[PDB]
Amino acid sequence: SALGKLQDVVNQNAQALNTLVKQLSSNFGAISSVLNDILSRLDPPEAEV
């Protein structure tokens, strides 16, 4: 436990990347998160919305 800052920087970068990746499986108020299923199983207007 001597090189604390060098490890903490990498840990913060990894956590930021993991959060950015996980932010793709959210609904954000929509029906689902998969775009192809939304555009296939729904009318064009609501799909575009």
Binding site: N18, V21, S25
Partner: protein, 99 residues
């Protein structure tokens, strides 16, 4: 059923095949088609319902006898087992970047 009458007094074995939908999940349906195994090429794959695009290499990841899919620490599709033959593939996107 005397074998001397006309064509209107002969046995006619009739079938009354009917179809109906209950609330239970469907267990009898029609057959499905399958294509060839084109690997080492960025194509579109659909094994049992999942989609994606990427090459299908032959990795060495050993799955469990009951497990079918495969993910990583990022919770993304990385390896899917082939339905026909028990061969674990590997899904990786093709080349992409800036010029």
């Amino acid at each position: 059923f005397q074998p001397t009458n006309g064509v209107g007094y002969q046995p006619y074995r009739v079938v009354v095949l009917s179809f109906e939908l209950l609330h239970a999940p469907a267990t009898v349906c029609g057959p499905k088609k399958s294509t060839n195994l084109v690997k080492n090429k960025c194509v579109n794959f659909n094994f049992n319902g999942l989609t994606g695009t990427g090459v299908l290499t032959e990795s060495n990841k050993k799955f469990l006898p009951f497990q079918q899919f495969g993910r990583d620490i990022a919770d993304t599709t990385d390896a899917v087992r082939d339905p026909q033959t028990l061969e674990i593939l590997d899904i990786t996107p093709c080349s992409f970047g800036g010029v």
